[PDB]
Amino acid sequence: DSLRPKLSEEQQRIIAILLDAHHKTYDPTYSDFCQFRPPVRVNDGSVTLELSQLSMLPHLADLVSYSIQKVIGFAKMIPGFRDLTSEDQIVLLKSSAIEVIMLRSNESFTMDDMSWTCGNQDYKYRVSDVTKAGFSLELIEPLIKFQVGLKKLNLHEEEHVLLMAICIVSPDRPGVQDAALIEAIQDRLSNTLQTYIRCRHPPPGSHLLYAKMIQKLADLRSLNEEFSKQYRCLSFQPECSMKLTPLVLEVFG
């Protein structure tokens, strides 16, 4: 009964632009990673030790900062994003940043050992590394769970880049001015996604896929809520700002 309309020339363009944007802003070789402050790993197995040393914070804070820059570059290439006021663009970028980082990080996440494998042994990021950066299991365990859930969706890159675009351009973000314009841009991206799934995705991965993707966006809201708490707690640690970056401090502060 459900119709399967073809992708319009505009919808085909949007996909092309977004695939192009991601390829311009996501390096699948992770070759810039050696330019960050070195990853330091010590003995642990302790929250007191974690906050005392914060050995993995300078490296992962440089990684996140770097990733924010890429997300910013990616957002500016979303069809319609430049039409928004620069004030609204920043509100959207600032509230979605960590969520899009979690989304895009899926490309490096592997279910072989439940880590983010960005090559090497140094640039393999386990759960233990994230605690060494001063974050608790309240964030990390649901994050890993989200990563696995998203991986099992076996998303086409097209679906993957549209989901990030939809995540960024969200009318229901605190502090937004022209919510009508943001919703209009999101709807254009959402229809493209819904149309893509219905006429490009083969069974049984096609059935109810869009609803599962919308649910992942809701999971991202929860992780962002928890991340915000933990970042606030982390910022209370003396001499913490040096371990972070001016960009990380503004976006999350």
Ligand X SMILES: C=C1C[C@H](C[C@H](C)[C@H]2CC[C@H]3/C(=C/C=C4/C[C@@H](O)C[C@H](O)C4=C)CCC[C@]23C)OC1=O
Q: What is the C-alpha separation between 5 and 141, in angstroms, rounded?
A: 40
Q: In angstroms, what is the C-alpha Rg of the chain?
A: 19
Give the CA count within 13 Å in the CB-facing half-sphere of 62.
15
Shortest distance, position 236 Cβ to ligand X, whole Å: 15
**What residues have CB less than 8 Å from 164, skipping those under 6 apart?**
22, 74, 100, 103, 104
CB under 8 Å, gap of 24 or more: what pairs does 209-214 form?
209/153, 209/159, 212/153, 213/153, 213/155, 213/159, 213/163
Which C-beta is closer to ligand X: that of 37 or that of 156?
37
Task: Tell me how far, at minimum, the Cβ of 105 lies from ligand X, in Å.
Answer: 3
Residue selected from 78, 102, 193, 220 as contacting ligand X according to rule CB under 6 A: 102
Breaks in the chain after residues (C–N exceeding 2.5 Å): 45
d(CA 22, CA 71): 9
In sequence order, what are the residues at sequence separation of 6 or more whose Cβ sits closer than 8 angstroms to the Cβ of residue 99? 167, 220, 221, 223, 224
b (16+ CB within 10 A) / e for 34-64? eebeebeeeeeeeeeebbebbbbbbbbbbbb
* 107 part of the interface to ligand X, by CB under 6 A: yes
Size of the site for ligand X (CB under 6 A): 19
Among 125, 155, 165, 189, binds ligand X (CB under 6 A): 125
Pick from 108, 131, 170, 195: which binds ligand X (CB under 6 A)?
A: 108
CB of 52 to ligand X, least distance (A): 16
Site membership for ligand X, residue 133 (CB under 6 A): yes
Q: Which of residues 20-59 bind ligand X (CB under 6 A)?
A: 57
Site residues for ligand X, 54-73, by CB under 6 A, read 57, 60-61, 63-64, 67
Among 81, 116, 146, 196, contact with ligand X (rule: CB under 6 A):
116
In the complex, residue closest to ligand X by CB: 108
Asked if residue 131 binds ligand X (CB under 6 A), the reply is no
Among 22, 104, 132, 216, binds ligand X (CB under 6 A): 104
Stretch near ligand X under the rule CB under 6 A, chosen from 127-135, 161-169, 183-191, 208-216: 127-135
In the complex, minimum distance from the CB of residue 27 to ligand X, in angstroms, rounded to a whole number: 8
Site residues for ligand X per CB under 6 A: 57, 60-61, 63-64, 67, 101-102, 104-105, 107-108, 116, 118, 125, 130, 133, 135, 248
